[PDB]
Structure formats: structure tokens, C-alpha cells
Amino acid sequence: DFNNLTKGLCTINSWHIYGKDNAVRIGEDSDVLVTREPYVSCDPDECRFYALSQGTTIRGKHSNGTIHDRSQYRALISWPLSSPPTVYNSRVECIGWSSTSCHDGKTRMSICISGPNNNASAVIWYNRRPVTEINTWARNILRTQESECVCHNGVCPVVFTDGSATGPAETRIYYFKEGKILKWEPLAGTAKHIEECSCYGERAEITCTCRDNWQGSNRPVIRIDPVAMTHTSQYICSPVLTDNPRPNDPTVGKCNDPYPGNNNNGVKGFSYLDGVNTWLGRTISIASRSGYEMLKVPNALTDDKSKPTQGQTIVLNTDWSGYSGSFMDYWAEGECYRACFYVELIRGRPKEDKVWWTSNSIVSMCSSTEFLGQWDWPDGAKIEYFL
Amino acid sequence: DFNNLTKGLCTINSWHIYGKDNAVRIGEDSDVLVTREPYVSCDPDECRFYALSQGTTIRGKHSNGTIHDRSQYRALISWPLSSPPTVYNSRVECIGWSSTSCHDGKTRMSICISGPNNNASAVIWYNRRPVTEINTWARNILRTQESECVCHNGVCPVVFTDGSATGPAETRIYYFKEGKILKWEPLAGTAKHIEECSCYGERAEITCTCRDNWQGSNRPVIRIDPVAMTHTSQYICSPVLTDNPRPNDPTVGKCNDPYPGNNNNGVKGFSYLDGVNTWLGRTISIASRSGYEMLKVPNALTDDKSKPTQGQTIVLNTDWSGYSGSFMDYWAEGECYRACFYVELIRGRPKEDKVWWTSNSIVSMCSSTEFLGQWDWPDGAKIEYFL
Amino acid sequence: DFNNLTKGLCTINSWHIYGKDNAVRIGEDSDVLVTREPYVSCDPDECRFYALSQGTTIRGKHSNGTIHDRSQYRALISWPLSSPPTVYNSRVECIGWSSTSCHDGKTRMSICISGPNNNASAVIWYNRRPVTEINTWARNILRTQESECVCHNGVCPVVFTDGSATGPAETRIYYFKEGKILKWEPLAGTAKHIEECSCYGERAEITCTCRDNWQGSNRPVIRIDPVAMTHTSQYICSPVLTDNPRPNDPTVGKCNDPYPGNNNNGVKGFSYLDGVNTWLGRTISIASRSGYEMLKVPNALTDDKSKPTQGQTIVLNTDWSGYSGSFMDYWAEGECYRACFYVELIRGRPKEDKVWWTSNSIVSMCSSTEFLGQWDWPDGAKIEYFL
Amino acid sequence: DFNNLTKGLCTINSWHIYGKDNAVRIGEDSDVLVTREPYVSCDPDECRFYALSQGTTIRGKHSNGTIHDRSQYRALISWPLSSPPTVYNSRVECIGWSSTSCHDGKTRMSICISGPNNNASAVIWYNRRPVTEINTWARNILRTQESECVCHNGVCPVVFTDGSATGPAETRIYYFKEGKILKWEPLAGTAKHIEECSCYGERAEITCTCRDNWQGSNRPVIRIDPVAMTHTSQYICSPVLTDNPRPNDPTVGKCNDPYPGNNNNGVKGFSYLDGVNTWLGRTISIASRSGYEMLKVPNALTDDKSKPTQGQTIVLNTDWSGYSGSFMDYWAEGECYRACFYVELIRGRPKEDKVWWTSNSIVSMCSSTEFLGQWDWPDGAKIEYFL
Ligand SMILES: COC(=O)[C@@H]1C[C@H](C(=O)O)O[C@H]1[C@H](CC(C)C)NC(C)=O
Ligand SMILES: COC(=O)[C@@H]1C[C@H](C(=O)O)O[C@H]1[C@H](CC(C)C)NC(C)=O
Ligand SMILES: COC(=O)[C@@H]1C[C@H](C(=O)O)O[C@H]1[C@H](CC(C)C)NC(C)=O
Numbered sequence A, B, C, D: 001d002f003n004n005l006t007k008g009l010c011t012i013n014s015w016h017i018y019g020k021d022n023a024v025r026i027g028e029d030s031d032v033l034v035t036r037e038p039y040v041s042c043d044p045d046e047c048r049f050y051a052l053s054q055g056t057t058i059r060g061k062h063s064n065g066t067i068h069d070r071s072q073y074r075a076l077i078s079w080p081l082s083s084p085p086t087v088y089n090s091r092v093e094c095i096g097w098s099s100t101s102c103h104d105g106k107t108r109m110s111i112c113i114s115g116p117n118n119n120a121s122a123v124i125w126y127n128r129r130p131v132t133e134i135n136t137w138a139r140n141i142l143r144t145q146e147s148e149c150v151c152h153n154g155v156c157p158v159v160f161t162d163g164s165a166t167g168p169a170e171t172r173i174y175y176f177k178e179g180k181i182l183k184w185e186p187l188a189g190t191a192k193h194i195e196e197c198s199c200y201g202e203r204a205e206i207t208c209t210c211r212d213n214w215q216g217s218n219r220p221v222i223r224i225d226p227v228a229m230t231h232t233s234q235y236i237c238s239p240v241l242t243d244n245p246r247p248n249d250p251t252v253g254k255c256n257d258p259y260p261g262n263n264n265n266g267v268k269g270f271s272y273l274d275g276v277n278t279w280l281g282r283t284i285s286i287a288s289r290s291g292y293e294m295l296k297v298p299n300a301l302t303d304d305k306s307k308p309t310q311g312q313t314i315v316l317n318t319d320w321s322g323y324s325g326s327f328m329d330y331w332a333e334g335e336c337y338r339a340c341f342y343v344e345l346i347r348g349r350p351k352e353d354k355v356w357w358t359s360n361s362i363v364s365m366c367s368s369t370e371f372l373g374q375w376d377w378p379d380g381a382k383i384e385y386f387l
């Protein structure tokens, strides 16, 4: 049967290490594919790492220029937890340069979009075979979440966006079931721009924390109802701004508008909005994608004045970070859903340009009800060795 | 039970990306085997890429001279969809330099022919064990389809050819069932020469579009009946000639004779003859194997005057193409058979001779009922990196 | 159902070769991960090699400095028996720099501890998903056995230690069941210091032979009761001292105190205390970790005067050895539990410093009731080839 | 249930290609292990290649000196049919420098012998776990078949030899069942010396064709009865001598004595003694291990004057050959047992000494009832590329 979001989030008193692949370190001497936009996603019997390959190894020569986001050589691949996406272990889910993937409890739905900027198309795969296609509707880079979607009794919502990435665009929430479109609706609510949504589900409710790439430094939130196939948007009120770049933390935030200071930019990110048990993610730097932390910000979603009451350093401020998304092993044993997340430790261009490539590692963690000590999880590689 | 061709072809209003392995790109730095004559074929629980290995990696030194078609080091290998045929992932189906393979719904039948030009032999494997052998009957390079065959209630027809490749030869249609020969018949119909057939089945009918290597630029078609174990040959009337090389498109074509202009040459190819829902494949160039397109030519099979009413670019005219064959996931969910095909993106010799090898990548697509945007799918490699 | 320790140890009249991976030899030309602290552990349907990867290949450049014990790039990996821990075959059980792992008959429990020296945390995984966490309690390198634990009717005891490694510390015996803590107790008995325990079970009794890293050269023994969840500590009376370094063998040993001569040092080790059928392991050298032997010392556990009555050379005195732990295929056929053990053949730093790395191979053997001839099992590699 | 030899041999009117791995070619650029003494053996659901690894890749530096037969780094490995024994695909069955392996229909029994020349020991594994050990009985290199054994209703006979390899020695026929010794008997019959036996079974009878390494150029035959656990020895009467080196073919051969001309040497080999349907194998050269042929010698086993009535070239006289053994897919479909065999194409030392290694490829073929054309199957590699 299809998995149903019947549990709530477990209490998050800290975060324990869940997974790390050290792909860039290892890939300096093994056949590791170049990637970006990774994520983690579970099936009923296993969890795996996911990402968009560049169709080349890091040590390979075609790794030169992998700083590019959309090429015909990209594809969503998945592989064994905490292992490196290698040419021999990676499994191609589908071909494209933007994806999302989730398991409905019975089987998996993976979606890859591919094509030219002005005329791309998305293909929904279910049970490893293509079932539905969706053509661009705004003709300007059709794109999806870049992280696991969430299903409920067969329904798996997926947030898409088509149009400008620096002004109003056409965002849509699609409701699929066995790869077939049951219904889709345009973005409603007060969020003024939706990009790469990070989602999670619990108690029949799916919460996606995305990124306002044009005006907000205070990421938008899209709360979805998988049963009524309806949703709503907004922002995280809290003054603890979580995008990047982003102006410094104010004392009050905006709930239904983008908090200004930075335009036309940002980084995929996530959060766990669950009352007092609410945790946020943010790069530590406000200027670039470096260092990453988790901060317990009670009621951030609604308390336009909320500040951290606890936190945890994930990646030091002197180490490279990047994309961060949420996933949960919905098939795990227990009375609740252990909240997990991943951080993308980008290496290479643009920041480290003595190499011609751009790749990343992965570090993943899940919540603990204990109050555990922390450690920073760097990619670990030495660009020097790559010169 | 054995799968039965009980559906018709789905409407083809466009073509979506199905698979791509970027083997030559990746193989520049990983252990990827040298190949040619690839194809795609599905089982009830998965689909895979297939090809004739050269028994050597691309970066390997024995890759030197892999421009040769028949050596004792060749063999039909299959591997995971959209992955590169590597030394560690490729599975040897059988040994030979010409094959065909299909699944009857219960298990798979793969056939490899091997041996000296004047005295080769074919071996039919069923359920991964050899069952039947067939010796040359014309003593001049025994050869098969080079792409998936099609079964119906246990019967899987396979088109063979023995004799000259530049004049009359002995072509036969064999009817196997569990690897055993039930019956074989000589080529009947008006087709004057049959080489490397591309087939597909629907509504108890198997249609193979082959290539008249000696006189036709307008590929022959062999329509087979798996129940009555009888067939018939002809050509595609349409003036939209689909072989290569080939003279320019006339206004009227030949239905029961080879359309002249080019002799003793051509390229394996496919087509989907289904009334108005009829689609053709052809290299874009008329001189060499470069660029590839799909064109909706209603009734091409019977309308000796038919012209394109719609089309789609698969590979740009400035990129290398090659062999193209048809396959369909006959075990997919749905009311019809989604038509798919693959294009072989040959790299190396003879066209690109600064390297001593000849290999290829793979790009595969299946039909969509939507009207999707297009993108060209190049191999992606840079021979420069290989020097 | 959960496996139950219902058999006794088979008679040990000699030791036959069980497993060897020649990872350092092979890894000189293949992608083999750098490791340390290996072990062997069985499931109901297979046995595998285990170890703490360094997140890098031996030939890789990040192998430089792998002499370090705790980094964020370490992780417990398992792979196919007698094969080398490669980047493509190794499976990540969990992330950390100290582990233990056992199967309760139904599924496996693996534990990895990770973090900064002054504030680490342990994570218990059961059935491949995290279930329980345990924070440092003495704030000075939380650590576990470094070898397989043993379960009984669902209960799997694990010996931990936190605090100084050169003076009194806090050792605890935890009793888990399906990853959940049922109960834990502090170290009782007369053992004055517990480090890296090697355990085995038979007839409802679990016996762990650990290492007194601060004062004893005569390793301590912790006998555990999985049903009553109670234990007891002591030392091996025998004068045949089995740690390293260690003073020369006296005529009488200590039963309830550390036998002096060497302080603040040692090597993980094991033993089989079973009446007259009692066998010990020890490096042959008394100065460093080189050469390894097995010696039948009847009643060593209680006979403060016992001497060898038989023995077997495992690794010559002129070859590098290291850690040694016990495991038994508790799911094997037969009336008893064939005692097995592994020896870690460390290569590289500190002893062989012309290379910048530190890795190891593995050699494993199990007891025979026959009286078999012996052979020494060297790592086999040549550091010269690595320069 | 256990497989039972209930069929007879199919008629052998020719031989078709079954398997080839091109390991040395491929291994010039991929991580292929160095091996010798290969063979092929089937289980109820698959067939695989087997051999004794050298614990190193061909391109690896430890490949230097792999000309040696017994080292502590050797081990019996098995892998996917027609693929190369790679570091990532090879599976270690057991550790040793002499093996044999067969499947009784329920599970597999593999045996590896290891140790010093004057005091080795054999370990019998059943269902992948060690069960029985057997110590040397003549104290001079304990050794087995080097090719698949044959079982009947649970009983799997294995021919061993201990003592001189150039004079009388102690050969024994062991009868195992689930790895346990049921009974063993010393070599009886008129064969004066037994080494590396090649066996096959049909109609409750197991026939092993071995090699008289001290006096015979006309290989001995040991016919075994798996039910009565009794056997008998002899030689192949035929004057078509099949060992190597060997004097030229006489007109009459010896039935119960070694045919003289060459002493203290030979090559593992096989044959199919089945009345008129009797086929022999022999290197084509009489001086070294080069070229290989199959010859239909009716009644060779009993007709001390029999000459070839038909034959087939397997490997040309100008290509390297070596060991040859028999195997049959006893679980194949059909009314008879298709006779198969493998030839070891040794490369490197001693013949080709510009390299410091010694490895091999594999070529395998099975009988056809057809009269198929032939082709020679060379290893394919170019030692030049290895310099
Ligand atoms: C696959 O490429 C990415 O994820 C790129 C990576 C890049 C980044 O932020 O580093 O922006 C993503 C881009 C987002 C817009 C908002 C700039 N999405 C697509 C589909 O092009
Ligand atoms: C395996 O080799 C091929 O597929 C070769 C490849 C070559 C080509 O067209 O590029 O012709 C094929 C040849 C066809 C005749 C018509 C020239 N078939 C065989 C079995 O030799
Ligand atoms: C993973 O690291 C090890 O096993 C190290 C290896 C090192 C050795 O003896 O070679 O000591 C272990 C150390 C033990 C104390 C007693 C010195 N344990 C930890 C968790 O740091």
C-alpha cells in the first residue's frame, strides 16, 4: 500500500551524523562522477544518495566546465548511502538537468526535466518507466525541487517553476499518482517567488521550504495538503534570515513578503517548521555558500520576531557548503518521523578556480532526541592534489 | 506466460528523452568497453542497453583498430539503462560479432553469430544457456538484426542474411520458441535485399524496417505474422528516403523496388509504420552518418508520394550519428505500446581519425502524446582529450 | 527469530585459513580504500570483512596522513569475504571512527561513534536505520570494541569506554535489543582498564578479551551474561602475556591485577578461554606489532601458572601484524561454534615510513578439529612499489 | 534435491563457442586480477568462470613474478561468464593454490588447499562455510583437480594427489557429501600417476581424464562410481597421444601403461570418452603449450589403435594455449548433457618473457549436434602494449 503521513516529527534536541560520502576526496583517485544538486531519498527497504551527474569523472577531462548547470550530459543518478557516485555504482533514474524523486510506498516516482532553455520538457517516471510528459508553459527553463518530494496515500505533490528566475514567474504545484497527473494548480498564497522546494511530510501535511530567488533572503514556505490537493504559500516570519547571500539578521522579519537586502540570487535550502520544535538551516556566511548551521528557532514560521534558543554547527564557516534539502525515512520504525537533511559541500568553481571543474560531496544528518555534541563535516578534499 | 502483442502504438505527437549513457565522455577516464551496433531491449522487470563489445577499453591500447567489425574479441553485452558499458557492469550475453535479443515474456533469447567470414555459425541462447546452433548457408558472413527481436505467445522471429552485401543474398526469417527452431522460410515479397532489421510488434503483427545495402536508399520493410509464421516484404513508398548515403528526396518513391542513386552501402535504421501515426528516422546528412531526425510521414509505407507533416531533431547535423533501431517496453503499464528507438552516436574512425579507435555512445527516446520541445543529443565527447 | 548461544566451542586442535584479502597488494593498482581496525562478522546468510575506511584510496593523494585515527572522513564499511575494501564494493554501515557490529539473527546492529575528542557521540543503527544515540559521558574520546559484538535472544552487549586511555576511565557495558537501550551498567570486577573488547559467545555466555591500555600486558577479560544482563571482569592469570608491547613471559601471572612492565600502550587482541580447549593470540614480538601466533594455553583464564602445550604461527616475526579480534559463524551448520579470528596486517606508518599512508590487509582463520600444518600469512605487499 | 547424473552425452558433431573473457586484452587497461588454472562450473541458476588469482592486477606491480604456482596470495575466485576476473567482480570462494569446485544441486562445494610444500592442508567448503579439513598425507604439495568436480545424489568425488610429481605418489579419491567425508580410497587400477583430473558425469558414471606427469604422454583415465563409491584407473589406449610435451603419435597406444617418450612433465587436459561419440583435446604443438584442437577419436578409451575421424581447431598453433578441463551445465534443459570444455590461453612467462608476469584468458565451448564451421580463439592481447 501507499505510505501515509500518519506521524508527527520527533523532538529535535540535536542532530546526529546520518551519511557522508567523501566523493571528492575519494574521486581524486577513483572513478567518481561530477555532480551538483544532490539529495537523499528513501524507499521502504533502503535509502540512497541522489544527484545530477555531469556525465564525466572528476579526474576526467570532460570535467572541465562542469560549472555549467544545464547540458545534454546531465542526469539524475542514485547510489548506495554514504558511498561516492561512481561510474560503476550510480544508477540512472532519468535524463535531465533538474529533478525530484519520491517513493509512494509501493514504488518510486522520479522526474527529470531536460532540453533547451526556451523550450524544455519534464518527464515523470513511475516504477522506472516513463508515464507522463509536461512541456514548458512559460518557455524559460522548466525546473523542479532538486530534492525528494513527498507522497500521501498515492498522491505525490511536486513544485515546479517556469519563467524568470529574477522576477515574477509561473510556479505550479502538480499532484501526481502513479506518474499520472491528477491535478495541478498555480501558486497561490503570499509567496512572491518559488524556486527549488525542500519538502517533508507528517500528519497528512506536506511542508516545503523553498527559495525566493529574486527578492527574499527569508525563504518562502509552501504548505501542501495531499488529500484536498490544495496548498498555500507564505514566508518564514522570523528575523533569522536563512537564504544566501542575505542582509544581516534584523529584529523582525516579514511573514507575507520577501525581506529585502539581496536580489536575483540565493541557495536551495530547507527547514523544519513544527511549533517550538522548529529548526532552520542556513549557510553561516551571509556573503557566499560557506559554512552551515542548524538553529532551533521556535515558531519561526509564525513568530515574526523569533530568535535562536539552540543550534548546531554542521559545516564550519571556513569550509564550502551549498544546497540543503530535507528527507525522512518514512518507513523507519517508531512512533514519529525522524527529521533529516543533507548539505551539499560544493568544491571547485566558482570559488576554488585553480581547477576547471565543479563538483560536491554530501553530508547528511538526522535529528536525535538526545542532546548530542557537535562536529563540523567538511568535504575533506584538497584542491592542491587536483592541480 | 509469454507476452502477446495485444496493443497498438500510442499516438506519437513528439518524442521524449528515454536514455543516454555518455559512454565515450565518461570512458575517457573510466573503464568503458569499446562498442558498436548498440540497441535497447526490455524484460518484464527492466530495460537495458546492448551492444557488441570489442573486448577492450577505449583508453586501452587494444582499442587500436576497433574500426574492424568482426574479430574473435567481440561479444554482445548488456548493462544498466543510461549507464556506460563498463568492464565491471557489462554482462556477456554471448560471444560473436552480430546479434539480436528479445524476451518472450517468460525469459530471454539472445543470439550471437561468430566465426570466419566464409564459414560462420549462429548460436541461439534461451534463458542464458545455449540451445540451438545454425551454420552458414551461403558461406559469406552470417549476420542478424543488430537490434531487439519481437516475440508473440512464445514465437520470436529473427531476420538473418547470408551471402553478398552488395548483390543478391540469402535472407531468412526464422521462427524460434524457447531457442528451438519451429520453422524458417526464405525471404519472400518484393524487397530485393535485407540487412540488419529493426523490428517492433503490436496487435499480433511484427514490422521490421531493414536496409537494402545494395540498391535501395529507401529501406525495405518486412512485415511478419508470429502466429501464422508467414511474412512479406516491400519498401517504404514515400519519397522521403531514409537510408544513408542516399540521393536527395524525390517527389515520388518506389513501393516494390529499391529507389536508386546509391549502391553497395547504407546504415541500419528503423521506422514506425502505423497509418497517419507513422514516423521515420534518417540521418540528416545524405552523404555520411551525421545528424539524425524523426519525421512524421503519414502512410509512408503505402503513400508513394507522402511528405513530412511534422518532425523532430534528435541529433544535430554537425554531430555524429549512426545506427538506429526500435524497441518498446512491451511490459509497460497502459493501453498501448509507447514507441521508442535508439540512435548510435559513432565516434572515432573513420570520420574522426586522429584516434585509432571506433566507439559510440547511445541516446534513446520514446514517443509522447504531448507536443514536446526538442533538443539535440550529441555524444558529448571531445576527441581532443583523447589525443 | 534471534540467534541463541546454544552451542559450545568446537575442539581447537589447529587453525585453518578462512579468509585473506591482500588489499594492500591489490590496492597498489586498483581503487582500494585505506583502512584500519578491521574485523569479520557474519549474518545468517553470509560473512563479510569490516573496517574503518579513511575516505580515500591507497594510491590516492588523500592517503597522505591516514596514520591519524579519528577524522571526519572515516566510516565503518563492510564488503565481500576475502575481497579488498574497494570504492565500488565497500558498503557504508555508518559514519564514525570507532565501531562494533553484530547480527541478532533477525537483522544487524552496527554502531559508529564520531565527533571531536572532547565531545563525541555514538549512534546505534539497527536494520540499517539509526535508532538510538549516546553522548560522551566522560568527554574524552568515546569508543567501542573495534570488532563484532555478540547477541543472545535479541540482546547484544557492547563494551564502551570514555575517559583517559592511560589511567582510570569510564567503561560501560550496554545491553541493546533492536538498537534500543534495555540497560547499561558501569564496569565491575577486578579489571583496572578496558579498551577495544574482542568477544564471542557460546552456551548463553559472552566472553570478551580486551586490552588494559594503561597498566596491563596481560589483557583483561570481561565475561558477560546476556540473559541476566550482568557481567564481571578480571585478567588472564596465565604468565603467557598476550599484549604488545609487553615485558617477557614470567612464570606466574596476575589474575585480578594488571601485570606490570609496560604502561600507556597496547594492541587490540583476543583469546578463546574454554577450559583445556583454551587458545591465545599474541604478536610474536614483545616490542612492536609484528608477527602473530596462536598458543594453546590450557586454563589460561584461571591457571596463574599455565604455559603453552601447543601452538601455531599465523604471521612470521618478520612481517607486520596488528589488531586481532574474534568472530564465529553462529549460523553455521554443526553441533558447535567453530572459533575464528582475524589479524590486522598493518602497513605503512609508523613502522614503514617511506610512504605517507597507513593501511592494512586482513587474514582470517577458524579452528579445525584436525591437526593441520601451518603457513605464515604476510600482507604480501612491497612498500618499494609504492615509492 | 541433489542433481543426479541421469542423462547421457549429446552427440558431438562439432563445437560451438560458449564463453570467452578476453581478460588479458581488457586487463591491459582495467583492474583485472592475474590468474592461472581456470575452469568453468555451473549451479542450477547460472554458470561462472573460476581460477586461482595471484592477488594482484596484471598492470599492478605485484604481478611481477606471478609465474610462481603456490604463494600465500593465491585464491580460488569465481565471476560472471565471459567477463574478466576483476578486483570488483571476482568472488573469493576460498584461499589456496589448488582447488576444485562443484554444485550438488542443492548448494556448492569448493575446495582450496594452501600451505608450505612440505606441510599443506585442504579445506572443504560447503554452502560457503568451511566444514572439513584434510592434512597432507605424503607431505609434498597436496593438490586437487584444478577444475570442476561432479556430484551424484549428494556425493561429489574429488581426486587428490600428494607426493612426488615425477615418480610414484599418493593419489586418493575422496567422496564428500555436504562437505563431509563419507569415504576415501587410494588410487586403484593400472594408471601409474594421477595429476589434475578433468571430470564429467552422465548416466550415474563419473569419468575423469587426468595427466600422468611422470611417464605418460597418453593421459590416464579414472572412471568413478558415485553410488558404490568405487573407481578404476587406466589410460586412453588410442595412439593419438594427448599430453604435452609428448612424442609423436604412434600407430598403437598403451591401454594400461604410460606411453613413453617424455618424462616429468605435462599439461592438465580433458576428454570425452563416450563410444563412437568420443572426443579428445590436445595442444597442437608437441613441444610446448601452444595451439589446441579437438579430435573425434572413436573408442579412444578402448581401441588401442584408434585414429581421428573428425576434428576441430580451437586455438591456432601460433597462439598460446595451456590447461583444458571439462564442465557441463547439468541443470540445462533437454534430454542429454551438452559436453563443454575450456582452454586456458596462458600469456606472459615463461614463453613470453619481456613481461614479468604470467596470466591467462579463457575460451570455452560446448558441443553441437550440428556440423558447425570453426574459428580459432586466441587470447587476443599484444605483449607489446604491456612493455
Ligand atoms: C541543475 O542546475 C541547478 O540546480 C542550478 C544551480 C544554480 C545555483 O544556484 O547554483 O542555480 C540552479 C538553477 C536555479 C535558478 C534559480 C538560478 N536551476 C536550473 C534548473 O537551472
Ligand atoms: C558487427 O558489424 C557490423 O554491424 C558491421 C558494421 C558495418 C557498418 O555498416 O558500419 O557493417 C556491418 C556489417 C553489414 C554489411 C551489410 C556491410 N555486418 C557484419 C555482421 O559484418
Ligand atoms: C579508530 O582508531 C583506533 O582504533 C586507534 C588506533 C590506535 C592504535 O592502537 O593503533 O589506538 C586506537 C584508539 C585507542 C586508544 C586506547 C589509544 N581508539 C580510538 C577510538 O581512538
Ligand SMILES: COC(=O)[C@@H]1C[C@H](C(=O)O)O[C@H]1[C@H](CC(C)C)NC(C)=O
Pocket (backbone or CB within 6 Å): D037, D052, D069, D070, D097, D098, D141, D142, D143, D144, D146, D165, D195, D213, D266, D267, D268
Ligand atoms: C596452482 O599451480 C598449478 O596448478 C601448477 C602449474 C604448473 C603447470 O603445469 O604449469 O603445475 C601445477 C602443479 C602440478 C605439478 C604436477 C607440477 N600443481 C601445484 C598445486 O603446484
